[PDB]
Amino acid sequence: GDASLKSNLNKPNGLSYIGTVSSVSELSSIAGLIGDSIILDSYVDGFNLGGGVMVAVNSDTVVDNIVTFQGNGVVWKRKLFNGVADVYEAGYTGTGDLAIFINKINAVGFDCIVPVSGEITTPIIFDIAKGALIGKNKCTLIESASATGDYYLTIVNTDTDYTNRDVINATALMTGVSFVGKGTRKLAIGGSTSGEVSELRISNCGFISTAGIEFLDNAYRILFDKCALSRSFTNSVIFNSPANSGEVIKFNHCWMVDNGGPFTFKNGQFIFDSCSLPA
Amino acid sequence: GDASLKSNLNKPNGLSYIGTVSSVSELSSIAGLIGDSIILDSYVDGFNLGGGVMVAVNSDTVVDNIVTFQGNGVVWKRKLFNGVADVYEAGYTGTGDLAIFINKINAVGFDCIVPVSGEITTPIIFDIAKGALIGKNKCTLIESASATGDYYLTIVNTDTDYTNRDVINATALMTGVSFVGKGTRKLAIGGSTSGEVSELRISNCGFISTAGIEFLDNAYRILFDKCALSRSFTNSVIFNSPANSGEVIKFNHCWMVDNGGPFTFKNGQFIFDSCSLPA
Numbered sequence: 429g430d431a432s433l434k435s436n437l438n439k440p441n442g443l444s445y446i447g448t449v450s451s452v453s454e455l456s457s458i459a460g461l462i463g464d465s466i467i468l469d470s471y472v473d474g475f476n477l478g479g480g481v482m483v484a485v486n487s488d489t490v491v492d493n494i495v496t497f498q499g500n501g502v503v504w505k506r507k508l509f510n511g512v513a514d515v516y517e518a519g520y521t522g523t524g525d526l527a528i529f530i531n532k533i534n535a536v537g538f539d540c541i542v543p544v545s546g547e548i549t550t551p552i553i554f555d556i557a558k559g560a561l562i563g564k565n566k567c568t569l570i571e572s573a574s575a576t577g578d579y580y581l582t583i584v585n586t587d588t589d590y591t592n593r594d595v596i597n598a599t600a601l602m603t604g605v606s607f608v609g610k611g612t613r614k615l616a617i618g619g620s621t622s623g624e625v626s627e628l629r630i631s632n633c634g635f636i637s638t639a640g641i642e643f644l645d646n647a648y649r650i651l652f653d654k655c656a657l658s659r660s661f662t663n664s665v666i667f668n669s670p671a672n673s674g675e676v677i678k679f680n681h682c683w684m685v686d687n688g689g690p691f692t693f694k695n696g697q698f699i700f701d702s703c704s705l706p707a
Numbered sequence: 708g709d710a711s712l713k714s715n716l717n718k719p720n721g722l723s724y725i726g727t728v729s730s731v732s733e734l735s736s737i738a739g740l741i742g743d744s745i746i747l748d749s750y751v752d753g754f755n756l757g758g759g760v761m762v763a764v765n766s767d768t769v770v771d772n773i774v775t776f777q778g779n780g781v782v783w784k785r786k787l788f789n790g791v792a793d794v795y796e797a798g799y800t801g802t803g804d805l806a807i808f809i810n811k812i813n814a815v816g817f818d819c820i821v822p823v824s825g826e827i828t829t830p831i832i833f834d835i836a837k838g839a840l841i842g843k844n845k846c847t848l849i850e851s852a853s854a855t856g857d858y859y860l861t862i863v864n865t866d867t868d869y870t871n872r873d874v875i876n877a878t879a880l881m882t883g884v885s886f887v888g889k890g891t892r893k894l895a896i897g898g899s900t901s902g903e904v905s906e907l908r909i910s911n912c913g914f915i916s917t918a919g920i921e922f923l924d925n926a927y928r929i930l931f932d933k934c935a936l937s938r939s940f941t942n943s944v945i946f947n948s949p950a951n952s953g954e955v956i957k958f959n960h961c962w963m964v965d966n967g968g969p970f971t972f973k974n975g976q977f978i979f980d981s982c983s984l985p986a
Contacts, residue, residue: 430709437716447721454719463753464723465746481722483748483755507748508759510793511822511843539844559844594962595847595885598913598935627962629911629933649983651933651960678960678981699981 513538563604585623606634611661618647648675663689738779792817842884864902885913890940897926927954942968
C-alpha cells in the first residue's frame with residue numbers, strides 16, 4: 429500500500445528502497461531518457477568502489493570507461509564528476525594489476541590519481557601529453573614476481589608537434605609514487621618514435637630495487653625533484669649517448685644509496701644539487 | 708497502481724523516478740524546510756556540470772553562487788562540499804570565458820581548481836590572499852582573439868597588513884597552467900595599490916606566445932619553479948626598476964626559448980638555476 433511505501437521511504441534508511449545498478453557491466457543494458465539519473469553501486473560488482481550517480485547523455489558521446497560508459501540507447505556519464513580521475517573510477521578493486529588502470533586513465537587523457545598501494549605487472553606507458561601521474565596515501569607500487577619485459581615504466585610524449593611541445597611539457601608531472609622492483613626491469617624515458625620528453629618534473633618518487641633508469645632518444649631537461657634511486661641492480665642510470673638527449677638533466681635533493689650498478693654518463697649534461705651518494 | 712510504483716522505484720534505474728532541479732536559476736524558486744535535501748542536476752540547464760545534492764539552510768546565509776545559492780525563502784548549500792572549489796561548481800559549462808570563473812572563485816576566497824582547458828578573454832585578477840590557482844589535466848588557457856587590454860593576468864595581494872603577509876605568502880601558489888597568448892597581453896605581478904606579492908611559487912606553468920611578464924611595485928622573491936617562458940612578443944620580462952621590488956627573483960629549471968623581446972633588468976636581483984636559453 430501507499431502508506432507503507434511512503435513510510436518506508438521516510439525511514440532513516442529510506443534510500444535503500446531505491447533500486448541501483450550493481451556494476452559497469454550491467455550498465456550497458458540499462459536504458460533511459462536523456463537526463464535520467466541512476467545509482468551505480470560500484471565499477472565491479474560487490475566492491476563498493478568507483479560508483480556514483482550517473483546521468484544519461486547522447487548515444488554519440490565518447491565512452492572512456494572512466495567518466496562515460498556504454499548504455500542501452502544512451503551513454504551514462506558521472507553526474508557529479510569533479511575532473512579528477514582515480515584508479516577506482518577506472519575499475520581497480522584493490523587487487524590485481526594496478527598498472528592496467530594507470531595505463532587506461534593516461535591513455536584516455538586524464539591525470540591519473542593512484543591513492544592506493546598495490547602490485548604492478550604489465551609495463552606502464554606514461555604519456556606526458558595526456559596527463560600527470562599522481563600518487564597519494566604513500567602510494568607504493570610493488571612489482572609482481574610474474575612481471576616480465578625490460579621495462580616497468582616508459583615515459584613518452586605522443587605529441588610530435590613543435591607548437592604543442594612547450595604547452596604540453598610545462599605541466600608535465602609525476603609525483604608521489606614509490607616503485608619497489610625485483611631488480612629486472614628498468615624505467616625508460618623517451619624513445620626514437622616519441623616526441624620530446626622534456627621539462628618533466630619527477631618529484632617525491634622512489635625507484636627502489638629496480639634495474640635502473642635508462643634515457644632514450646628525445647629525453648632532456650628532466651627534473652628529478654627529491655627522489656630516491658637506491659638498491660638498484662646491474663645499473664643505476666643508463667645514458668648511452670642517445671640522440672637528441674642529455675641537456676640539463678638535474679637531480680635535486682636526491683638520495684641514491686646502496687646501488688649495485690653504475691651511472692653511465694656517455695655524453696650528456698648532469699646536475700647533482702644537494703644530493704647524497706653512494707653510501 | 709502502488710505495486711507498479713514500488714517496483715519502479717526498486718528497478719536498477721529507480722532513482723530516475725525522483726524529481727530534480729534543473730539549474731541554479733530554477734533553484735531560486737525552490738522552497739523547503741531547513742534540512743531538506745534536493746538534487747541539482749547542473750549549474751546551467753542541460754550541461755550536467757556543477758550539480759549536486761543541496762540542503763536547505765537559514766535564509767540569512769551568505770550566498771556566494773559557488774557553495775550557497777538563493778532559494779525561495781531559504782538558501783541552498785552544497786550538502787557534500789569538501790572545501791575544494793572547481794570552475795564547474797561556479798558555473799563553467801565547457802565553453803566561454805574561463806577567466807570569469809577563475810575570478811569569481813578567487814574573489815570569494817577559495818583555491819580555484821581548473822581541471823579543464825579552454826579560452827580566456829576578460830583579464831584575470833589573481834589575489835594570493837584569497838587562494839591558490841591550480842590547473843589539472845594538461846590545463847591550457849588559450850587567449851581569445853577578441854581579448855583586449857594590456858594584461859591577461861594580474862597577481863595581487865589585497866592584504867596590506869604586515870602581520871598577515873608572512874601567513875598569506877607562505878602558501879601562495881599558482882601551478883599547472885599553460886597560458887597561450889596571441890602576443891598582445893602581459894602578465895603583471897604586484898601593483899602600487901597591492902600588498903606585497905612575495906614568496907609566490909609559480910610551478911609547472913607555461914607562458915607561451917604572450918607579450919611578457921611585467922613586475923610592478925611590491926613584487927619580490929617570486930619563484931618560477933620549472934616554467935616555460937617562450938615565443939614571447941615584444942618583451943619577455945619587464946623589470947623597469949619598480950619600487951619595493953626585485954629581491955631574489957629566481958627562475959628554477961625554466962625553459963626560455965624562441966622569444967621575441969628582451970629581458971629588461973633595470974636593477975633587481977635575478978637567479979637562473981638549471982635554465983636553458985635562448986635557442
